[PDB]
Design a protein around this ligand. Structure first.
Ligand SMILES: *[C@@H]1O[C@H](CO)[C@@H](O)[C@H](O)[C@H]1NC(C)=O
Ligand SMILES: *[C@@H]1O[C@H](CO)[C@@H](O)[C@H](O)[C@H]1NC(C)=O
Length: 293
């Protein structure tokens, strides 16, 4: 096939040194089993102040006051809105606001786009690349709403102390400055391992090898919300008839994230109809709270 690109990646470009030792790809999972596996083995938590070197004087007082779980959520109904241009002229704005909590990505604005993407922002998941390279992040007031979470690609299952020395993007200083400016706004840092714990499951069930790069923010977001909501609506992750190669706002596929396989997994767990995906690009997945495992 054309997956030679992946194997080529392993022989001389394994940037994250991924060494998958789990059940070879292709493991068949019923919907409920996959849901439990995802629930028990993808530990979605934030870096705590007891995690060295965040327990040192340099990081003293900089991490959020209260625990992530005992502050954010839970909620009954939630929505995950991708930044896909497929949302332009979707009119999903209303529907989207009709949820308890909403999670958006990076700099996705709501101003002037409400009718399509909604006007609410409960949680905001951002890449370390954004917070590091975007000066507007320290000024634009859109980052002031809701809760913020930033994540940074790390070496395969690297320990926090190990990751900390070799961050993909060094965003620590910018993270600090922001905290001072907005001391009351909860701003967490995803644990370095959670992306890889999720990656491991995606690989476990995929037909074959997947890109040795972490899951996209989209996939991480869907996961985060599943541990916080009873129900989760995902808009335009699984593309609709309005599929396009740009964001709904002027700054979009790639060859980094194992996007294809993340999509197949969400499709497997989708409780919605094919029509709603085609017309609305809407998928509905159950959260973890009430499942039996
Ligand atoms: C998940 O991460 C948190 C934060 O470090 C940790 O305290 C908890 O025990 C972890 N859960 C598992 C099962 O590894
Ligand atoms: C922080 O944690 C590390 C390892 O867990 C420990 O060795 C160090 O002394 C701790 N710092 C303080 C002052 O608690």
């Amino acid at each position: 096939p054309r997956l030679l690109k992946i194997w080529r990646n392993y022989l001389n470009m394994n940037k994250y040194k991924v060494s998958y030792k789990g059940p070879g790809p292709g493991v068949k999972f019923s919907v409920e089993a996959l849901r439990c596996h995802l629930r028990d083995h993808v530990n979605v938590s934030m870096i705590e102040a007891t995690d060295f070197p965040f327990n040192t004087t340099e990081w003293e007082g900089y991490l959020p006051k209260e625990n992530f779980r005992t502050k954010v959520g839970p909620w009954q109904r939630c929505a995950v809105v991708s930044s896909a241009g497929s949302l332009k002229n979707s009119q999903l704005g209303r529907e989207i606001d009709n949820h308890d909590a909403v999670l958006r990505f990076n700099g996705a604005p709501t101003d002037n786009f409400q009718q399509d993407v909604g006007s609410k922002t409960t949680i905001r998941l951002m890449n370390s690349q954004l917070v590091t390279t975007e000066k507007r992040f320290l000024k634009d007031s859109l980052y002031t709403e809701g809760i913020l979470i930033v994540w940074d690609p790390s070496v395969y299952h690297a320990d926090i102390p190990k990751w900390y020395q070799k961050p993909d993007y060094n965003f620590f200083e910018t993270y600090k400055s922001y905290r001072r400016l907005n001391p009351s706004q909860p701003f967490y840092i995803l644990k370095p391992q959670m992306p890889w714990e999720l990656w491991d499951i995606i690989q476990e069930i995929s037909a074959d090898l997947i890109q040795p790069n972490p899951p996209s923010s989209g996939m991480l977001g869907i996961i985060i919300m599943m541990t916080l909501c009873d129900q989760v609506d995902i808009y335009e992750f699984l593309p609709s008839k309005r599929k396009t190669d740009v964001c709904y706002y002027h700054q979009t596929m790639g060859a980094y994230h194992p996007l294809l396989f993340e999509k197949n997994m969400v499709k497997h767990l989708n409780e919605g109809t094919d029509e709603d995906i085609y017309l609305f690009g809407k998928a509905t997945l159950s959260g973890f709270r009430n499942i039996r495992c």
